[PDB]
Amino acid sequence: AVRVAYAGLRRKEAFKALAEKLGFTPLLFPVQATEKVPVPEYRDQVRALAQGVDLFLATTGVGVRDLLEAGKALGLDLEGPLAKAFRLARGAKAARALKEAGLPPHAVGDGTSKSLLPLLPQGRGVAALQLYGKPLPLLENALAERGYRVLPLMPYRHLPDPEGILRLEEALLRGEVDALAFVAAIQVEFLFEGAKDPKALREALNTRVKALAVGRVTADALREWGVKPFYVDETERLGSLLQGFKRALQKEVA
């Protein structure tokens, strides 16, 4: 039977039940330590943004929407400050959310944070950066290097599980997994950033192990780390991912 590993923490029960119903042999290898944890300083972080920024960088569509809602609930005017700032979006999702909010981006990257480096302006002031659970040293440091005071905007903080990341990498290189499902891009990132041999990992996921991604953003993370997704669930539902995956497997043999 096809051994399908799950890197989420979230829906382990649903995954197990789903995989079995399909005749798959379910494996659980989480890469996150625990549930999303609140960031103390967030509220003050949003108040800071309300004071005015020269540059605003958005990484996700959900992130922009949640930030804007938080601002309106706190009685803060965020649309004003962002209206006079240079707005950059990492990719299409972030761009659309900004667009729909009446604050279209001035430039958009290719879905990867690294693509924003070249697009950063030259000036001194404050650069607000909407995050999705983890720090982005490369981008943050690029912003500071450009002369901006980086203002991280992260509502929740995700925890990687070193121990679990290594067990997952061990398993993959050892050939105990046939497919690996990632429900979120941060899971792909925690895995490669915590791995001891990312290239053996990349190699495994490009030949012996089929990488499955829930959502285009999760897929973007796999491609960014040099992995070609075997299957991408555009409907963002774990159930559809496994159903569609089982269909893809059969079609390869048909």
- C-beta separation of 54 from 74 below 8 A: no
Q: How many Å apart are CA 230 and CA 207, to the nearest integer? A: 10
Q: Check: CATH 3.40.50.10090 for 37-157?
A: yes
Q: Which two tokens stand for residue 217?
A: 């953003």
User: Distances from the Cα of 169 to the Cαs of 28, 141, 147, 223, in angstroms?
Assistant: 13, 29, 39, 18
Q: Which class for 1: exposed (0-12), middle (13-18), buried (19 or more C-beta within 10 A)?
A: exposed
Would you list the domain boundaries of the chain?
Answer: 1-36+158-254, 37-157
Task: Calculate the alpha carbon distances from 211 to 7, 35, 195 in Å.
Answer: 11, 23, 16
Beta strands in the chain (DSSP E): 3-6, 25-28, 37-38, 55-58, 86-89, 107-108, 125-130, 148-153, 156-157, 179-182, 210-214, 231-233
Q: Report which residue type is found at 130.
A: Q
Beta strand 25-28 pairing with 86-89: unpaired
Cα–Cα distance for residue pair 251/131, rounded to 1 Å:
38
Contact 225, 180 (CB under 8 A): no
For the structural domain made of 1-36+158-254, what CATH number should be given? Answer: 3.40.50.10090
Identical fold, 1-36+158-254 and 37-157 = yes
* 119's tokens: 């697009």
C-alpha distances in Å from residue 96, one per residue of 32, 50, 195, 249: 29, 22, 33, 34
How far is the C-alpha of 19 from the C-alpha of 138, rounded, in Å? 37
Place of tokens 């690996």: 180
Alpha-carbon torsion 213, 214, 219, 221, what sign?
negative
Q: Read out DSSP for 46-81?
A: HHHHHT--SEEEE--HHHHHHHHHHHHHTT---HHH
Identity of residue 77: D
Experimentally determined by: X-ray
Which residue in 240, 102, 114, 94 sits closest to 189, CA to CA? 114
212 contact partners, CB below 8 Å, separation of at least 6: 4, 179, 180, 181, 182, 229, 230, 231, 232, 233, 241, 245
3-state helix, strand, coil in the chain (%, to 5): 45, 20, 35
Cα angle 40, 46, 51; round to 5: 135
Residue 176, helix vs strand vs coil: coil
Q: How far apart are CA 42 and CA 188, in angstroms?
A: 25
Q: Measure the CA–CA gap between 241 and 51, rounded to whole angstroms.
A: 43
Q: What is the resolution of this structure in A?
A: 1.6
Q: Give dist(CA 23, CA 9) in Å, integer.
A: 22
Q: Provide the CB-side half-sphere exposure for 141 (13 A, CA).
A: 5
Q: Where are the extended beta strands (E) located within 68-140?
A: 86-89, 107-108, 125-130
Strands (DSSP E) found in 90-124: 107-108
